[PDB]
Amino acid sequence: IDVLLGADDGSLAFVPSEFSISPGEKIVFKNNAGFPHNIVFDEDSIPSGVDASKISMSEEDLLNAKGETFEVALSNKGEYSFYCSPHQGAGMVGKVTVN
Ligand SMILES: [Cu+2]
């Protein structure tokens, strides 16, 4: 599944921001508008034995170019909340469910 980082109208959002995938299904987060961006999984809001470092960027890591991506496949089932560090306050957050 492809996820835009920033909407085509320049809104600071993940598009789509809520979605469900199966184990091992790729997520490709792609810089679209209002970059830089990143994608950080909330380490208190993912399946409790999952290592957030295996699946996310750090808060300092950034995707700088339009069309630059971050790809991840999630294995463990359950809810994963994530956000874009610089833009979290503006609402640039999401949640993916692995079912
Ligand atoms: Cu952002």
Curated annotation (Swiss-Prot):
Cellular compartments per GO CC: chloroplast thylakoid lumen; chloroplast thylakoid membrane
Binding note for cofactor: The crystal structure with reduced Cu(1+) has also been determined.
Keywords: Chloroplast, Copper, Electron transport, Membrane, Metal-binding, Plastid, Thylakoid, Transit peptide, Transport
Record's keyword annotation contains Metal-binding: yes
Subcellular location field: Plastid, Chloroplast thylakoid membrane
Required cofactor(s): Cu(2+)
Entry function: Participates in electron transfer between P700 and the cytochrome b6-f complex in photosystem I.
Stated name of the protein: Plastocyanin A, chloroplastic
Lineage of the species this protein comes from: Eukaryota, Viridiplantae, Streptophyta, Embryophyta, Tracheophyta
